[PDB]
Symmetry: D2
């Protein structure tokens, strides 16, 4: 079977269209299903609270654009944009976007990277979590607060102080092992190596997991995991870390 | 190297985001360069002249969205929209859209499906051509006439006459081997299996080519060919017909 | 399904274990069946008549070794050894080797490179053929004569005259496009790019095919084609020339 | 670059030719190097002490057979056959086989699955280990003894009582998670999910590792790890468990 994968992304976001295809490409070596990727974009170059709200306005229009392609699953990407709207807004965004695709006769399951990260942590049975984000301090405080408010405790967190979404995309993932290794990780159940949708994390995931001996999640994997589960499919995916290997 | 590929598609279009990734996915078995695919949508459900002009207006918007992602090449899918704007428009669209990406501090080479088809036909040394399209009669006249206007004779042509863009993508490609055989192909230098970006063709390509003993081109393969030449990469792609091996 | 592929190769041969996996690796992008490859070796360094008879003796030994692995198909690589045993020997080798696998409680279909080439040529409707081989003159006479004996006219043929089997595998395939163009190909139904299992050809295949506008076959592609027909699997393989798409 | 991978295997062994290619195929999605696989076989259908010694006699002849193909690395497979010859014989077998390829002018690095498993455990810094084998009790006692004698402590071990090497190949890997989960694994640094070269383990590796939170090794991964290290190459391989992700 062919699965049509839909992705609403920030215009400048390059990672989701890399890591999600990479994961599912890897899945095709282990499971029969074969995937095709389809994207709609909303303009956004710089990660600021105002540029994020504006981008969330185009959220609906992108879901229209993607339902025109009778897509099997929709992944609404920007994690930070939802968490900056208020508490538990991921659930709101999901409902709303679901309705959009219904008002287009193409009812599709809709998955946010925010909700995917929350559901992903719980699916592991992780009560305490560490977080790495590329964003500026106040913006990451929102992310940490949002997670804490979703019932998940946050131990040690880190902001990498980058706002240029392009520069975030060109952040070397092999910095990440060293970064995580300098955080208090042992007091923690699971490591959120990227509470972000733009920062490359895939190539560090298994490396980090190996040297920290704690499960490692990034939004990308959490989204693919959610997409997989939403289509009632096995979630074994080589190089997908702990979450992507018999946890669904 | 990782080459980032941008694609401007009609919202309903599902073929370009299949056949081009598929094509490049195969080039990865032969050449070291890796590809990532990034897409932007423009609303349009039914293939009509008025909806084609509307869609072409949103062309600039999309080129902004994809140049926000510092994309290495741009593919403006949907040749029919270009050819229904009048003769030679592929060059006009190219020129303007390149300016758009320059004006966004990320100058990239831009490729129209129309221009690719013409240039690809020329690269074969083909002077006469047979054409298959899924469009209605008038819209297939526009395409045939436009090709002729570019110094290429059009022999036999056929319309499938499907106006709904979702039914065009649901068309069985295994019909095409038959459909083409009932045309005149001996007096024709090359076969345009699909003068469309929405009708699946790739799976029929080398199969038609085999029985006709004549070179076979789709809009998809041409776009992929053009992109590779724009990047100064070798153009051999397994299962991509004549045009995609030491091309050409 | 996982199809297990057995290959009897000359110890020095490195081409069969490349081009066939490569071919099937591409069939995995088009068809759901997965392949595993299992090989058995017979000592032979230099391509001479006496060393060819010696190698053919060890043929049975190998067929035991590979049927110990309950292999789904067997490929007896090296057509020259078969064709230097005298006319029609491909059928004799097949028959006997099948008996060998039956006698080991694992009856499997057995395919000679020789028989495949003949059968593949026949499946094209090709009555005349051009041949390129890396062998010395006498050994290329044997091949040409043997083909003729199977009711297929041999037009122009060429020898590369390399006796050392390691230098045959180190041969640049990009020479072949040129080498073939300086032959007569217009009066010939199809081109045997490689009447050898040790000379690399696959990368030149669709490229030669393009410029000649004539069907191109290697021993490798024929073996792969034969194996697929033996299994009742569709024979479309991307980048496998005419013979490998809705074959044929 | 193309890397020629050589593998000496039991005639009936189907797993090495599956899991080693699978791993390295997976590596090609993460690293530039591309691999080709070449096998020589020694006859063996049933895992018994006598049939193992006989098979180790052909060990040299297979190394001759493979050096005829100027191979980059040689993996001598059968793990149990070496450990049943005496203490620390893996080091002896390596030296001897190395000499064979030198007496063939094709000096190649030679890797045994035995030595690869020993080196693999140490490379993790694992002083205590759990073991699963498919073999009959006394034969697995040899394996356990051999490891203990190599300085590595064995906690809880398991024999699955199967001698038919074919039946070992058709052992469901999803039995393995349940099997391991019924062993005392927490007293142990690393899990040897397959102290064997024939029992499929690849598909359970990440699943086991996830639910046991201890590093998981099988001979296949240990061999690929060793092969990779011997060619001075990065050892990141998706789905390769802990050992195959930045440990070299």
């Amino acid at each position: 079977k062919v699965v049509r994968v839909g992705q609403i992304v920030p215009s400048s976001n390059i990672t989701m269209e890399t890591e999600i295809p990479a994961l599912l490409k890897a899945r095709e070596l282990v499971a029969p299903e074969r995937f095709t990727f389809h994207s709609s974009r909303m303009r956004m170059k710089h990660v600021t609270k105002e540029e994020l709200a504006r981008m969330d306005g185009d959220s609906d229009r992108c879901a229209l654009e993607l339902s025109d392609a009778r897509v099997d699953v929709m992944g609404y990407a920007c994690l930070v944009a939802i968490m900056s709207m208020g508490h538990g807004y991921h659930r709101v965004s999901a409902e709303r976007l679901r309705n959009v695709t219904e008002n287009n006769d193409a009812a599709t399951p809709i998955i946010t990277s925010a909700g995917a990260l929350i559901d992903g942590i719980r699916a592991l049975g992780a009560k305490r979590v560490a977080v790495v984000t590329p964003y500026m301090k106040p913006l990451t405080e929102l992310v940490v607060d949002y997670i804490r408010h979703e019932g998940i405790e946050v131990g040690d967190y880190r902001a990498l102080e980058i706002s240029d979404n392009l520069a975030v995309a060109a952040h070397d993932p092999m910095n990440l092992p060293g970064i995580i290794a300098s955080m208090r990780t042992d007091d923690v159940d699971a490591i959120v190596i990227s509470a972000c949708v733009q920062m490359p994390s895939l190539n560090a995931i298994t490396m980090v997991e190996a040297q920290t001996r704690k499960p490692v999640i990034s939004a990308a994997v959490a989204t693919t995991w959610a997409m997989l589960t939403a289509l009632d499919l096995p979630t074994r995916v080589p190089g997908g870390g702990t979450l992507l290997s018999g946890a669904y």
